Design a protein around this ligand. Structure first.
Ligand SMILES: *[C@@H]1O[C@H](CO)[C@@H](O[C@@H]2O[C@H](CO)[C@@H](O)[C@H](O[C@@H]3O[C@H](CO)[C@@H](O)[C@H](O)[C@H]3NC(C)=O)[C@H]2NC(C)=O)[C@H](O)[C@H]1NC(C)=O
Ligand SMILES: *[C@@H]1O[C@H](CO)[C@@H](O[C@@H]2O[C@H](CO)[C@@H](O[C@@H]3O[C@H](CO)[C@@H](O)[C@H](O)[C@@H]3O)[C@H](O)[C@H]2NC(C)=O)[C@H](O)[C@H]1NC(C)=O
Ligand SMILES: *[C@@H]1O[C@H](CO)[C@@H](O[C@@H]2O[C@H](CO)[C@@H](O[C@@H]3O[C@H](CO)[C@@H](O)[C@H](O)[C@@H]3O)[C@H](O)[C@H]2NC(C)=O)[C@H](O)[C@H]1NC(C)=O
Ligand SMILES: *[C@@H]1O[C@H](CO)[C@@H](O[C@@H]2O[C@H](CO)[C@@H](O)[C@H](O)[C@H]2NC(C)=O)[C@H](O)[C@H]1NC(C)=O
Ligand SMILES: *[C@@H]1O[C@H](CO)[C@@H](O[C@@H]2O[C@H](CO)[C@@H](O)[C@H](O)[C@H]2NC(C)=O)[C@H](O)[C@H]1NC(C)=O
Ligand SMILES: CC(=O)N[C@@H]1[C@@H](O)[C@H](O)[C@@H](CO)O[C@H]1O
Ligand SMILES: CC(=O)N[C@@H]1[C@@H](O)[C@H](O)[C@@H](CO)O[C@H]1O
Ligand SMILES: CC(=O)N[C@@H]1[C@@H](O)[C@H](O)[C@@H](CO)O[C@H]1O
Ligand SMILES: CC(=O)N[C@@H]1[C@@H](O)[C@H](O)[C@@H](CO)O[C@H]1O
Ligand SMILES: *[C@@H]1O[C@H](CO)[C@@H](O)[C@H](O)[C@H]1NC(C)=O
Ligand SMILES: *[C@@H]1O[C@H](CO)[C@@H](O)[C@H](O)[C@H]1NC(C)=O
Ligand SMILES: *[C@@H]1O[C@H](CO)[C@@H](O)[C@H](O)[C@H]1NC(C)=O
Ligand SMILES: [Ca+2]
Ligand SMILES: [Ca+2]
Lengths: 48, 973
């Protein structure tokens, strides 16, 4: 929530729903990266 | 270097040589003599320009009142008809039969959507519509993203189907009527007569995105003018997808605005700045809006949100009252995502009585709280609109006119006033046109006042076009000379009718399109702007014309006579023309109509020929087999009779003209006698010249071709070999040189063009012209313009015999007013003939202006095309320079110095003509450039707007403004 809260302020019309805006959402995102599923997308967004 | 008396004596033997060559070979005094020899084939009547204007002002009154009556009945039927509609929802049971525009008309298709049934119509081809049309029913336009077959749309096509009987009753009564259309609140439009729409949806690959609600005609009659003020939220949270959406809504919101509407754009993030250079509400014309749409785009989001400084700045903007203002609906709309503060305190005082209306827009996909924003909208009698997407922008930034129309629909009959739109290009390609609108109201159960829940919206708006070619038939210019014309004007300064006004849209800025970012097959929007050229931009501006222009915006009558300079037809000359203006109001409308005449045009010739043999004998004069002893005759495409049409191929036209007089006597019971007759009289006057004078002197030595461009269209170039090179417009009221010959009292020389295509130099030659000038009973007349194309080679020999052919000591040239190069000593200059002299030695030309020998005026042409700049054609502004003698003095001696050199130039002006002779030392002796002073349409982006609007042009707004009815619902958001 620090490093990536806000920060997905891209001007694209696509959705990046696994983001780190709230606390419920951040928690869901952290868990998804533990199940391993699609964590590369959550990392690519943190680099862009 | 020869003395000033030697140049004086040597000019006087070669202006005496050109003028004697032109006075003798053309036949000025002979054509004067035969207009005066007859006296009785014609009579001389006056142009009473008080009377003519009054007569014209009334045909546009009656035209635009006749349009109005039709509009009123359609509206009554629509109101009555929909009050008796039942709102059914069984439409697969009872089909709605209608013809849908923008659908394949191929019989074998048979799509047959549920609820609806189409029509295959039969489509005759037509005139007054330049497209195939059906007079048996009305077409229906559904916009593309709107589904048809929706109960909301299916129920319009049911009740609106009773308009086809009233549509038909308007055209039966008046054949000339143009499109008749009802634009629905629902977004469905029906027009008569039916024709296929110009863009089908998917049968080509361009797709129309046309919405009736969006249209300017629909908007002006939807609602009253308005001073809006866009707030933009620029806090940090907005940055992202949401910030991207806002820049496209505001641009979209503006499209909605009109000239009568004033608008500024502010933006807040813990301080409210204003987005551009303006700081007050500005007129929201094509230009101002272009500035605001160019500053909305560069915005960057950063900082804390403050709705208190954002609405303080907004209210203060709303209260300026020093500036020019709409003063009608005052509304402020804020684009923002989420608000935690309702700003209750700012609204208590700034708008305690709710004079202002607040509209809040929540944009993008986000989690910020929308309750406070909704509350603000509810408190202020505004509305709330979400926009998550780009496809949601187009119907929510046009939808606020449903709110602003409410206190108009509570005004009753008082609100049913016809209003006429600014000239604009028709959706169907008709040409320039204006539409008169009326709003239809939803009255259901009026008898008993039963509901009113949705009875505060308009059903839609009804319009009817007038084409500007219909108004130009009520303002006839043939009796008057080429110089005379009629100008029409808004109470906004825009010109309804003008010679200068053109079909191309008025352009703003220098067009820049990026080729690296246009994917090839997507079809962007083309244009929708109105063609708002102003009177002080259609003509060269004076101070004695801003007096005339203001004086006929505020509905006064008058005359005025003064000396002003006319810009030439081609954009190269400026001629001081003593004009008289005369204006009066069109009493039914807010247009005021004027008329320019040049003193000497106060009298015209009417043909008074009626004998059997005399109209006969003059008519075989214009036979194309008889051009071996007459001269390659031309003829102007007037609307002589209704049957023979202007063709743009002139040999085509002159056969169809001259067939017409053989196959039928010129009495012609559906055809004006005077126009054809004058032409016949004229052709017997440009015959007796070509028989008894020009065919005697069959070859003059330096003379190439000899013409008589006359009034009656009949231009006669004398050898048929020469008439192939005659590259003029055959309409005599469009020729540039014809009009410059009438202003001047001396022989006029026209410079040939530089480069280009076609033979226009050695082959045809430089031409001299001169208006014929007769006096009948002490009444001045200038019926015709004689002329000569000169031979450039012979002229050189006389000129050569202290200037040699190719001299290195000094060079001399002859320049007509305007500074164009006609004759050159060197032979590296006479190759580039007809070229602006400041492009071949820019150092001397620059000095000449300084000496006061030459004067100039740069103007703006707001309707021109140009290639784009990287940052096939768009419209753009060009700046145009013309040059003209401002000093009457005959000679000008001096020296110019570049730095380290002197050149001694001597300038003498030939008497009795526009030509000037200058002697100067060879350019090669002093190697000098300054910069190349060029005279061309030069792309530019001026004048800057931010400085015009600090002192705007005078203007007069609409008298009736409907807003703030006390019994408005003000409860739905
Ligand atoms: C260049 O200079 C020559 C000579 O001045 C000028 O000449 C033509 O010159 C001859 C030489 O005498 C003239 O006779 C001729 O003019 C005609 O004849 C008599 C002369 O008095 C008069 O009726 C008229 O001047 C005129 N009328 C006629 C013959 O119909 C004169 N005109 C021509 C074109 O032959 C050239 O015109 C000069 N170069 C130009 C054309 O600028
Ligand atoms: C909107 O669409 C409806 C449905 O087509 C139209 O209602 C129809 O109107 C016609 C004439 O008003 C009716 O014809 C009449 O039928 C009765 C028998 O039902 C007959 O006695 C009459 O002499 C006449 O033939 C038609 O029945 C009626 N349909 C229904 C279902 O009631 C309506 O006219 C359309 N509205 C507009 C404004 O065009
Ligand atoms: C002009 O105003 C009238 C009312 O003053 C509008 O008529 C109303 O239209 C609504 C449309 O939503 C009708 O409501 C519908 O009722 C049906 C039942 O038939 C129901 O199934 C729908 O869910 C919806 O509630 C309503 O019947 C009707 N009101 C009256 C009094 O007839 C009319 O739409 C307005 N004109 C236009 C062109 O919109
Ligand atoms: C436009 O209407 C005005 C009246 O509003 C006309 O002015 C009248 O002119 C007549 C003679 O032509 C006078 O007898 C009247 O006294 C004038 N009106 C008033 C109230 O004084 C004007 O003639 C009309 N012009 C056109 C071109 O229709
Ligand atoms: C168009 O050109 C004329 C030149 O004849 C300008 O008129 C002169 O303007 C200067 C100032 O620029 C005055 O001092 C002179 O008194 C004017 N002379 C005459 C005869 O009018 C005129 O200003 C130019 N118009 C524009 C818009 O620049
Ligand atoms: C202050 C700001 O960001 N606004 C920019 C400005 O800097 C830039 O000069 C202009 C043209 O690029 O567009 C806008
Ligand atoms: C067709 C052609 O050769 N056009 C030329 C053009 O390239 C050149 O710029 C101009 C000089 O002003 O002369 C002309
Ligand atoms: C009205 C006017 O400006 N006339 C002047 C004149 O006084 C002067 O002698 C001449 C030569 O410079 O230029 C011109
Ligand atoms: C452009 C030009 O010729 N400038 C001359 C230069 O050649 C010369 O050397 C100098 C001294 O006489 O005077 C200056
Ligand atoms: C106006 O309507 C009347 C009646 O139909 C007609 O006689 C007249 O010609 C019309 N005028 C114009 C300019 O259309
Ligand atoms: C303009 O008016 C004056 C005064 O009536 C007149 O002498 C002059 O000839 C007119 N201008 C022209 C170009 O004829
Ligand atoms: C004439 O030239 C001089 C010197 O270059 C300059 O100062 C002056 O402004 C010029 N006059 C005009 C009318 O521009
Ligand atoms: Ca996996
Ligand atoms: Ca914010």
């Amino acid at each position: 929530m620090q490093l990536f809260g806000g920060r997905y302020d891209f001007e694209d019309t696509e959705v990046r729903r696994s983001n780190f805006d709230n606390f419920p959402q951040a928690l869901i995102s952290v868990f998804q990266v533990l199940t391993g599923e699609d964590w590369n997308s959550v990392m690519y967004n943190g680099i862009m | 270097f020869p003395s000033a008396v030697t140049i004086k004596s040597w000019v006087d033997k070669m202006q005496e040589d050109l003028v004697t060559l032109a006075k003798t070979a053309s036949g000025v005094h002979q054509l004067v003599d035969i207009y005066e020899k007859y006296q009785d084939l014609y009579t001389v009547e006056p142009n009473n320009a008080r009377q003519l204007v009054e007569i014209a002002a009334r045909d546009i009154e009656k035209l635009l009142s006749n349009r109005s009556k039709a509009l009123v009945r359609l509206a009554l039927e629509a109101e009555k008809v929909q009050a008796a509609h039942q709102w059914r929802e069984d439409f697969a049971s009872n089909e709605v039969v209608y013809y849908n525009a923008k659908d394949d008309l191929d019989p074998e298709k048979n799509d047959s959507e549920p609820g609806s049934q189409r029509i295959k119509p039969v489509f005759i081809d037509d005139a007054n519509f330049r497209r195939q049309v059906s007079y048996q029913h009305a077409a229906v336009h559904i916009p593309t993203d709107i589904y048809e077959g929706s109960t909301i749309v299916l129920n319009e096509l049911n009740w609106t189907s009773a308009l086809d009987d009233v549509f038909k009753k308007n055209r039966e009564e008046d054949p000339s009527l143009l499109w008749q259309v009802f634009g629905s609140a629902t977004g469905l439009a029906r027009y008569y007569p039916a024709s296929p729409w110009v863009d089908n949806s998917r049968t080509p690959n361009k797709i129309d995105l046309y919405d009736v609600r969006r249209r300017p005609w629909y908007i002006q009659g939807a609602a009253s003018p308005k001073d809006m003020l866009i707030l933009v939220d620029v806090s940090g949270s907005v940055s992202g997808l949401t910030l991207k959406l806002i820049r496209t809504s505001v641009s979209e919101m503006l499209e909605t605005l009109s000239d009568d509407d004033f608008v500024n754009v502010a933006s807040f993030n813990s301080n409210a700045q204003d987005v551009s250079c303006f700081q007050h509400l500005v007129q929201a014309n094509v230009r101002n809006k272009k500035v605001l749409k160019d500053a909305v785009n560069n915005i960057t989001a950063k900082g804390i949100t403050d709705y208190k400084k954002g609405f303080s700045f907004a209210f203060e903007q709303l209260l300026n009252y020093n500036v020019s203002r709409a003063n009608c609906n005052k509304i402020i709309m804020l684009f923002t995502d989420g608000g935690e503060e309702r700003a209750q305190e700012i609204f208590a005082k700034y708008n305690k009585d709710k004079k202002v209306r607040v509209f809040t827009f929540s944009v993008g996909q986000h989690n910020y709280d929308r309750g406070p924003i909704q509350w603000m909208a509810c408190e202020n009698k505004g509305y709330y609109y979400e926009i998550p997407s780009i496809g949601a922008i187009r119907i929510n930034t046009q939808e606020y006119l449903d709110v602003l129309g409410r206190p108009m629909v509570l005004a009753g009959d008082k609100a049913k006033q016809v209003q006429w739109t600014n000239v604009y290009l028709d959706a169907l390609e008709l040409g320039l046109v204006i539409t008169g609108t009326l709003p239809v109201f939803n009255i259901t159960g009026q008898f008993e006042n039963k509901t009113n829940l949705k009875n505060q919206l308009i059903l839609g708006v009804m319009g009817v076009d007038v084409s500007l070619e219909d108004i130009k038939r009520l303002t006839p210019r043939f009796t008057l000379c080429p110089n005379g014309y009629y100008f029409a004007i808004d109470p906004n300064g825009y010109v309804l009718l003008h010679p200068n006004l053109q079909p191309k849209p008025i352009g703003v800025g220098i067009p820049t399109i990026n080729l690296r970012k246009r994917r090839p097959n997507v079809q962007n929007p083309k244009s929708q702007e109105p063609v708002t050229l102003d009177f002080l931009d259609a003509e060269l501006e004076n101070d004695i014309k801003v007096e005339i222009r203001n004086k006929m915006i505020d509905g006064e009558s008058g005359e005025k006579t003064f000396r002003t300079l006319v810009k030439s037809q081609d954009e190269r000359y400026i001629d001081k023309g003593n004009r008289t203006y005369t204006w009066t109001p069109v009493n039914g409308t807010d247009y005021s109509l004027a008329l320019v005449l040049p003193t000497y045009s106060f009298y015209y010739i009417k043909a008074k020929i009626e004998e059997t043999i005399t109209q006969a004998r003059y008519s075989e004069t214009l036979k194309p087999d008889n051009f071996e002893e007459s001269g390659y005759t031309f003829l102007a495409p007037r609307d002589y009779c209704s049957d023979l049409k202007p063709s743009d191929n002139n040999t085509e036209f002159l056969l169809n003209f001259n067939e017409f007089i053989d196959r039928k006597t010129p009495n012609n019971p559906s055809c004006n006698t005077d126009l054809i007759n004058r032409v016949l009289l004229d052709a017997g006057f440009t015959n007796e010249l070509v028989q008894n004078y020009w065919s005697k002197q069959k070859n003059i030595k330096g003379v190439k071709a000899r013409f008589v461009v006359t009034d009656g269209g009949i231009t006669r170039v004398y050898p048929k070999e020469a008439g192939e090179n005659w590259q003029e417009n055959p309409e005599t009221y469009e020729d540039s040189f014809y009009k410059r010959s009438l202003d001047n009292d001396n022989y006029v020389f026209t410079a040939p063009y530089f480069n280009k295509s076609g033979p226009g130099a050695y082959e045809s030659g430089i031409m001299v012209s001169k208006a014929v000038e007769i006096y009948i009973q002490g009444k001045l007349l200038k019926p015709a313009v004689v002329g000569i194309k000169i031979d450039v080679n012979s002229w050189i020999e006389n000129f050569t015999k202290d200037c040699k052919r190719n001299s290195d000591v000094m060079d001399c040239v002859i320049l007509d007013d305007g500074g164009f190069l006609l004759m050159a000593n060197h032979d590296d200059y006479t190759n580039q003939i007809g070229r602006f002299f400041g492009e071949i030695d820019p150092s001397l030309m620059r000095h000449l202006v300084n000496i006061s020998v030459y004067a100039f005026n740069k103007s703006y042409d707001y309707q021109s095309v140009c290639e784009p700049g990287a940052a096939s054609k768009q419209s753009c502004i060009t700046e145009q320079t013309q040059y003209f003698f401002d000093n009457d003095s005959k000679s000008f001696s001096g020296v110019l110095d570049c730095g380290n050199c002197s050149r001694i130039f001597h300038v003498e002006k030939l008497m009795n003509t526009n030509l000037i002779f200058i002697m100067v030392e060879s350019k090669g002796t002093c190697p000098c450039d300054t910069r190349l002073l060029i005279q061309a349409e030069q792309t530019s982006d001026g004048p800057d707007p931010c400085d015009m609007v600090k002192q705007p042009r005078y203007r007069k707004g609409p008298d009736v403004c409907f807003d703030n009815n006390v019994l408005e619902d003000y409860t739905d958001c």
